Each structure stands twice: as C-alpha cells, then as structure tokens.
Design a binder for these strands. Structure first.
Lengths: 150, 98, 127, 100, 113, 206
RNA sequence: CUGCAUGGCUGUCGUCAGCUCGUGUUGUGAAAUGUUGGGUUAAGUCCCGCAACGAGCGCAACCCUUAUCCUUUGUUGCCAGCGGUCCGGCCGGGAACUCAAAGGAGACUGCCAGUGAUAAACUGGAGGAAGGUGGGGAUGACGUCAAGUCAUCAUGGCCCUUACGACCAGGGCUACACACGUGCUACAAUGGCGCAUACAAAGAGAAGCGACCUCGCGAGAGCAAGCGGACCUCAUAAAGUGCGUCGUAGUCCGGAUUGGAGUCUGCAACUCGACUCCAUGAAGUCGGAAUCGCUAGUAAUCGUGGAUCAGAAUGCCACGGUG
RNA sequence: ACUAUGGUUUUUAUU
C-alpha cells in the first residue's frame, strides 16, 4: 500500500532491429534457462516457413497485429460482491499483452513440441477458435455485452 | 634470521603487541623489515536458542582469529633474547623456531 | 601509453588494459568474439566498445577469474569503461550517460535461518 | 546425570594409562583371521573378551558440568545448552554475537 | 503385440525386449545379443531380420517363470510349514524387508476406493 | 518473555574475554575445562572475599589472575605467605606455576557485584528488603550513579507470592549500546526457595 | 509428580510505536491534558498548534557486514615496471594490480524544480561510486497468549527407596483397523542418457583428508607424499553448450516389491544399519472440493560443503551457477 | 461502497 516503483527501459537488438527480442526472451522463460529461450525464440517460423510472408526479420512481430488486444478484465471486490470490468489496454502494456497472448498454446495443447503448437496456433490467428483462445476471445464478450461503464 | 609468530583474537591488540616488538627490534638491530598484515580468519555459527523446541530459530555468532609474523632480518639473535625479557601487551601467543 | 580499469560483479573481478593503435581482443588468452560464443551476456562486453567502433582503432587485453560467466561479463563492462574513459576523455561523459561507469550492485543474498531455499519461505496452510 | 556414569568416565581416563600398552595389542591378536582350526589363545580368550569399555563405541564427550549425554560440538568443546551462559560470561575466547 | 514373450508392448528397445516376461535380467538382456551378433540399437516390433527368433531357447534353458519363482523361493523351502519370520511372511501376502504399514501399503493389498 | 544478559549482550562492542589461552581444537574441551576448573574454585574461595570481578589469563605453561576486592587485607597476609598458599593451590589445579594480582576497589558501593552483596547478605539475614534496597539505590546515587534499578524475584519475605519489585531511580537505558550498564544476578536460598536479586547501574554514556 | 507453587532461562504480536515520571490545569473520581488534532514520516519521526511545560525508556543512531575514491604497505594470495632467464611468480624483487591490511576522504535532502503551511516532507531533476531508510543483517521497550522449561541448573511441597533404582545378559521406542502434513522423484521433448567441454564459491581435514600407484566389476583394501593452514589432500562443481538418440510407447524412462553375492563398523547387524554389484519386477500418461512462496540477483532450479558420530540421514545449517 | 443468506465454540487457579 505504500511501496512505489516503475518499469525498466530496454533497448532494440543490434541484429533484429526490434524491441520484441529484448523482452520476449524473458517470456515463456523458466528455471533461469535463457539459453533454452534463445533456442526456441521464433523457432515456429521454420514450421511456418511456407506461411511466413516477406522478411523473416519481422515475420513474428507482424503476428501481434492479428493478436490485436483491445481490453483486459480486472476483477475486485467492493463490500461482499466481486465485480468484473473490461478496460481498454494501456499505451505500452497493449504490446505486453499481445506478447503474452501469443504463447498461450506453446505447451497446453496436444500437438507436441513448442514450435508445432505455436505454428498451428499462429495459423488460427485470424478467427481465433477451439482450444487455447479462451483468454483472448472470452475477454471480448464482456466488452460487447456491456458498453456503459464507470 | 627468523619469524616471530604472534597470534591473537583482536586487531588493536596484535598491533599494540607488534608496536613493542618493532621498537625492541630497533633497540637491538637499528632497523626493521616492517609490516606483514595477512588475510584475517573468520568463522560463523548458528546456535539454537531453545534446548529442545524451536528448530527454526538460530542466533548468528562469529569467532575471528589474527596472525602476525614480524620477520627479523638481522642474524644477531639480540631481539630473540630481548623478546624473552619484554613486557608485552596481554592476550597473545609468541613462538620462535630457527 | 597503456590505460587500465578494474571491474566487479557478484564477487567476480576483471582486470582490463587498453592501448592506442588497432589490434587484439583478448580474454584469458582467448578471443572476445569466441569466449562469449553463445552466452546470454555476450553483448554486455560490447556496449562500450561499440561506442568507439571496435577492432578498427585500439588494442584490448582482459584477465578475469572466479564466479559466473555473466558475472565476469558484467565486471568486464566496468573494466573496459574505466580504461576507455581515460583513453578518450571526450567519451567520459558519454559513458556516464550510458551508465556503464557505475559499480554493479547485483551482489548475491545469503540463506536465512528457518528457510531452506535462499529466501523462499517454507509453506504453511493451516493450524 | 548419574553418579555411576561419571565414575566409569573417570576410570576410562585411567584405562588409557594401563590398556593401550599391551591389552589393545592382545585385542588385535585375538581379532586376527590368518589361522584356521588351530589353537593359540584357548586359555586366554576369556581373559580378553572380559574388557569392554575399551571399545570405540558407546562413548560421547558429555558435558563436564552437567554430565549431559548429547549436545556436544567439537568447535566449542562445550555442550550446546551451556554456550549461551558462557558467551554472556565471556568464558570462551574470540566468541561474539554479531549477525552479517 | 506379444512378439518377445508374454508382455504386450508393440515397439520396444532391443537391449531390454526380454524384460518383464520372467526369464532375463537387465544386463543379460544385452549380453544375450552380443553372443549371437544381434544388434543392440533400434526398437523392434516384429520377427524380422533374425533379431529375436534366434533367442527362444537361450532364454528357456535357465530358470524361467515358475522355475525362477521356485528358485527365489529356496529362501523359504525350510519354512513351508514353520512360520519363523520369512515363513509366515510368505504363507500370507506380507512384507519381509520392513514395511511402514501406517502409510505406503496400497501396493501390498489393493488400491484405495 | 525477557531475553539476554544486560552486560553479556555488550561483549559485541569489541570487548576482551575473561580468559585468553591458545590450544589446537583437538584439546579444546579440556583446555576450556581447565578454565572452568580454576574459575569455579577461585569464585568458590572468593565468595566472601569482597571481590567485584575476576579475570583469568593463561600464557604458555603459565597462569596469571587479576582479582578486584574492596578489602585486599582478607586475601593477602603474613609477609605475603597467606596468598603464597593460594598461589600453591591454584597451581595444583592449573597444572602450571601461577601469578596472583590483587587490585583494590574504590567506591565499592557503586559496583554491581558489591551492591548485590549489600542486598543478598541482608536478604539472607531476613532484613526488610524494600528498605535495604531503597538505601542501596539512594547510596549509589550519592556515591556516583546517574541511574539505578535493583529488582527482587520470588518468595518476597517468605510469602506465597512470586512477581518482582524494584522502584527505579534516575535513567537506565535498555537498548543503547553507548550506555555501559554495570550488572549482577544473585541467589540467597535460605530454606524455602532460591530468592533471587538483579541489579543495573548507569554512570553516564561512553 | 506439580512451571497455573517458584528463582533462572527461552518464545509471540513486532521490531508494532508504543509505556511512563515530574510539574501546571481539569474531574467528586476512575482518568484525561500531555501521548489527541493538523501537515508529514519508516516511526510518540519531523514540523505546526492548543492549558499544557518538560523529562525518562522504546523508536533513529551507537553493534555486524558491504559498496568507492585517494595514499602507503604485504604472507604460502598478486605480477604493471626492473635484474636473472628455457622462459615459469620460477629465482632476485616489487608492493602497480585482482586480493589483503592500515592511513585518509565521501552523503548532508547539501544543490536545482514543483508540490506543501515560504515548515517538515514527497516526487521529479542535477552532480556522485553511493540519495532521500544506500544494499543486507544484531538489537524487543510497556503489553498479550497465566506461551513454554521441575528435562540443564537451583528449589518449596508431593512420591518411590524389602523400589519404578542401576550393575549385568537382554526387550520396546522404525508395532497400524487411515488419512493428512513434511521431504522427494518420475509422468519428460522447453526432456533424459552417454561422451566431450565452458564458468565456481564456501568449508572441513594428525587413530584426519588421503594424492601417485596397485588390487577388488565396486563398495573397499594396501604401499605411501604433504598439511595443521592461502602448502597437500576431499575435488576436473553440476545445471549450460555441442553430437548422437528417443518421438504416447503405461517409454532408453521410472523403479515400490524382492532373491542372491560382496564391502564396512562392532563384543554382536536378521529384526529396526550403511555401501556396492548382479537378477526380477507393480505403480506413474496429469491429477477433486482446494492451497502456497517471492517485489530482484529475490521466485525459479541444479550443483558443493558443515555439524552430530563405532557404524548410517533424504531432517538441520552453509556457499556458488543461470536467472 | 451493498454479495443472496446461516447457527454454535466446556471449565478453572496472580493469591
């Protein structure tokens, strides 16, 4: 209730020209295994090599334009009642949410291997259907069933 | 030519002991070789505060130990006689073996 | 004329030496390009050298011992900086603006009593 | 702690001045394996199976002020439950409460 | 299925393919191959290439199934009516190397409801 | 619950220890036991010698003791022969030739060990402890104290009551390390319990 | 036996800001005012104010540790210059530097800008190695739970003493009508195994650690160096990386159960020990109502020591790696 | 701020 902090500023990679590689290697990272992270980083662009489009330098960051986060749901309690609100995503954190939603299927699906799960889910990217899409699609229901908040 | 092994449990003690050994060694040799400081040794302990209960409570204690060597570069043995006719700071051990 | 710099991180220590005139990039007798061949910290040693453009104008020598490899890398960034800020005093302010000249504060914490895994507390649910 | 226990512990210090001369060598003699189905100690084996406090087992340092069976620490030469008394009385050289 | 013996696995590592059928140990399951020049690599599923149709008698010429059971039951052949420790602990389904029966006992009698 | 000895807790202010001897760890339990052997005998034989403190020192095959008393004339005597007897018997349990130094106390009724004697002996004499303690407190503030607490525990006057009683004067810090408090704890026993006393004396900050 | 009869000794809220005394005022008094209010704080902290004026204890600091520059120096640690010199911190030597020890300096919201009561203070800025509590640790006031200990010591009462003793040969305290907590490993593919290889800290070590070397499938045993501390030994740290290989297969995985054969301590090991090598082998493919830990070198997660001790910990403490 | 809601915790020791 009184500790006040901020955010750490990060630089674009000298090879990849993007700020995505500066943060995305810390996402899906576990047990301090950052060399495993540097070994699965965009490794689905080989399982998607026939569906990658022009320039593999941007061929993963273009997917965030189809991950397209719009709202995040917060749930808190006032008195006895727990309530839920869909709020619009914030000007820098909108990119962090896209970076979180893009790895929802990376283990929690039957396809085997991270790269194949991710390439299959990056090919469901336009419609967003079936498994691993709950946190992406069902958050939007709350913002289309209600447009009168304070 | 000999080292005088000086041992203590305190820095200002081992130094104020040294301070009369290097003063004796100038009275019995005109000059001295000067300092030898050494890395200071330290041990830690975590001791139980309860005889049988409270296994997750342990208090944090140290034992620090000091050593000095002096090093005598005059072969005249005049300091190793005077070292055994010297009022020295209390709480130290002194040894010599040529 | 030779320049020198000290650097420290996570109890590890670096001794870095710089000379004018193009040449080597040495670390524990090995190449700086190859010693950090895959290491996650491989750009950390490069950031201050890039700021003058590397392997085209000066000669670099490094000695490092003990601790971690990301530790030795983060110590080297300060050691390079401490020599480079005397080799180019026009860069002394650029290195302050990049923060590479400040002492690394990421020292390791110690195990607590009543705890097993550093500072993860043994769990308790109910009486 | 039992008075008959310290009696045995004190006699064990005098045992170290009468047993390690030759009886510890007789214990080695009757523990040898090299000979088979031939007698060499037939009348003197019962004269060496009797001594038993000379065994390496069943010994603890014990507290020299409370006879306590357990709680010893070789770094202190003192039973653990008597350290907090000594460290407040100043009775162990070099020992200090610090934290770090 | 059931090509190496009584056990059902379809595709199995060749150096242990004779395990879990009562006739071969873990090292013997690899030694039995090198006495006949049989390959110690790649999983097997059928009676192809001589890889296991050559091993039928080399397993059966030793204690197997009930003959192996009878040999590891020599421990109790003097205890087939005398109950002294191992005797009673074999005349009924019971532990012989200590059992902390107040936990970890489902495996001795049957699974929890 | 109360915790830690009010003077023993201050040894962490780089203070020296009550004995200084050197020996390798494999003989440390017996080299420490020799220290108890002399300290316990010397305290037992100085229990009524008006002694305020005892310090031991054990140089190489030597022993050097320093004791403080308000009345050296009951420790030395007969052209030094009455302490030459004490020198003989301490060497008999130390296993080394001895030296014995006797220091003379000034303002003894300001020292926590001798202020504790002033109440412990009178508690054994069944004296009215509230008066005896009040005088001991005011006399300390007369002689040189800047604050004092004397605290009695258990069977107060032989009664079926436990608790504690003290009545504090001046200022006595608790958790300030520059305070240097002079402390003691005693027992008077008699026939019905243990009947304990504690004392804290403050003289000014270091 | 009784710590709800006690001295001594040790928890917990909490390291929370709280507990009191003198004086002046108030109320019949308990007691309030003070110590509440306002701004602010890590805080009865720091400013402001009012019938309250001051003081004592706790609180900040003093204890412990560590981060930097400047200067001088050093062993068995170091090696920039210099002599010797295959070239080797090796010898001579140096105390430049990692490190070590001492000497000195540095930090104060001091400086800028808003906010705010032109205060205190916060947030932001500048300079600085360090900034607002620098990072990380002792320290427990006055109270609560009549906390816990007659199982250290001491002790009032009570009890056993033709005993329940403790000498000796020996038992039980690793007995299960059933579940949970703790510790832990697999179900793996972001994996595991073998082989190679990068980057360690800390500590223990004279009936010890035990090298080289020999023997024993191995545990272990023998010959036997050095070391008592920066000597010589435990001891090439493992995850990480690289090749090969597995590919839902109740798996190379994982081994409960279990039989034999060796090793080791001991007067004696089967029960209720450890270590090793074989042969035999079930479960585990994902988890119910529910629950837990960390704010940063932290959570993650693999390695390495220490105590106890005839012989044997997975429990206790302690130190690194990636992060 | 206000969930839509729930009944009940043996006794006793600072004299």
């Amino acid at each position: 209730r009184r500790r006040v902090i901020g955010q750490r500023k990060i630089l674009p990679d000298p090879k990849f020209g993007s700020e995505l590689l500066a943060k995305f290697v810390n996402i899906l990272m576990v047990d301090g295994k950052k060399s495993t992270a540097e070994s699965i980083v965009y490794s689905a662009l080989e399982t998607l090599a026939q569906r990658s489009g022009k320039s593999e330098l941007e061929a993963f960051e273009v997917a965030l334009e189809n991950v397209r986060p719009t709202v995040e749901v917060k749930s808190r309690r006032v008195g006895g009642s727990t309530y839920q609100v869909p709020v619009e995503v914030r000007p820098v954190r909108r990119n962090a949410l896209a970076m979180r939603w893009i790895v929802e299927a990376a283990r929690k699906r039957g396809d085997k291997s991270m790269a194949l799960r991710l390439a299959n889910e990056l090919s469901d990217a336009a419609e967003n259907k079936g498994t691993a899409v709950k946190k992406r699609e069902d958050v939007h229901r709350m913002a289309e069933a209600n447009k009168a908040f304070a | 030519r000999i080292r005088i092994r000086l041992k203590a449990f305190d820095h200002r003690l081992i130094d104020q002991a040294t301070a009369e050994i290097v003063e004796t060694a100038k009275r019995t040799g005109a000059q001295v070789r000067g300092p030898i400081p050494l890395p200071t040794r330290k041990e830690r302990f975590t001791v139980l505060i309860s005889p049988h209960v409270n296994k997750d409570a342990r208090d944090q204690y140290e034992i620090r130990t000091h050593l000095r060597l002096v090093d005598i570069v005059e072969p005249t043995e005049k300091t190793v006689d005077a070292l055994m006719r010297l009022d020295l700071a209390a709480g130290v051990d002194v040894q010599i073996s040529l | 004329n030779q320049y020198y710099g000290t650097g420290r991180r996570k109890s590890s220590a670096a001794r870095v030496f710089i000379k004018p005139g193009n040449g080597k990039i040495v670390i524990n007798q090995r190449s700086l390009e190859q010693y950090f061949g895959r290491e996650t910290a491989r750009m950390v040693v490069r950031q201050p050298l890039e700021l003058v453009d590397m392997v085209e104008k000066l000669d670099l020598y490094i000695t490092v011992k003990g601790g971690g490899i990301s530790g030795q890398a983060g110590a080297i960034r300060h050691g390079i900086t401490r020599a480079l800020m005397e080799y180019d005093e026009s860069l002394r302010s650029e290195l302050r603006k990049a923060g590479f000249v400040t002492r690394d504060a990421r020292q390791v914490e110690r195990k607590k009593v009543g705890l097993r895994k550093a500072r993860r507390r043994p769990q308790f649910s109910k009486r | 702690a039992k008075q008959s226990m310290k009696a045995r512990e004190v006699k064990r210090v005098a045992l170290a001045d009468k047993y390690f001369a030759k009886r510890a060598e007789l214990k080695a003699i009757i523990s040898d394996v090299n000979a088979s189905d031939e007698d060499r100690w037939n009348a003197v084996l019962k004269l060496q199976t009797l001594p038993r406090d000379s065994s390496p087992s069943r010994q603890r340092n014990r507290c020299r002020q409370t006879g306590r069976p357990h709680g010893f620490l070789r770094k202190f030469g003192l039973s653990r439950i008597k350290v907090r008394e000594a460290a407040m009385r100043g009775e162990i050289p070099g020992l200090k409460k610090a934290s770090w | 299925a059931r090509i190496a013996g009584i056990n059902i696995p379809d595709h199995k590592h060749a150096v242990i393919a004779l395990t879990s059928i009562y006739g071969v140990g873990k090292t013997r399951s690899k030694a039995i191959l090198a006495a006949a020049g049989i390959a110690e690599d790649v999983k097997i599923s059928e009676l192809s290439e001589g890889q296991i149709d050559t091993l039928r008698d080399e397993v059966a010429k030793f204690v197997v199934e009930g003959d192996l059971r009878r040999e590891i039951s020599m421990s109790i052949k003097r205890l087939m009516d005398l109950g002294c420790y191992r005797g009673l602990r074999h005349r009924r389904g019971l532990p012989v190397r200590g059992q902390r029966t107040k936990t970890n006992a489902r495996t001795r009698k049957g699974p929890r409801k | 619950g109360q915790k830690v000895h009010p003077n023993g807790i201050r040894l962490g202010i780089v203070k020296p220890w009550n004995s200084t001897w050197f020996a390798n760890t494999k003989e440390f339990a017996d080299n420490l036991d020799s220290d108890f052997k002399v300290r316990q005998y010397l305290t037992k034989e100085l229990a009524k010698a008006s002694v305020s403190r005892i310090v031991i020192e054990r140089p190489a095959k030597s022993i050097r003791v320093t004791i403080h008393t308000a009345r050296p004339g009951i420790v030395i005597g007969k052209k030094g022969e009455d302490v030459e007897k004490l020198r003989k018997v301490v060497a008999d349990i130390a296993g080394v030739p001895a030296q014995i130094n006797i220091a003379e106390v000034r303002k003894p009724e300001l020292d926590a060990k001798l202020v504790a004697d002033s109440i412990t002996s009178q508690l054994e004499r069944r004296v009215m402890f509230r008066r005896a303690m009040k005088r001991a407190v005011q006399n300390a503030m007369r002689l040189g104290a800047k604050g004092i607490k004397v605290e009695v525990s258990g069977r107060l006057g032989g009664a079926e009551i436990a608790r504690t009683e003290w009545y504090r004067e001046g200022r006595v810090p608790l958790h300030t390390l520059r305070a240097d408090i002079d402390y003691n704890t005693s027992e008077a026993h008699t026939t019905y319990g243990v009947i304990g006393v504690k004392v804290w004396i403050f003289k000014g900050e270091i």
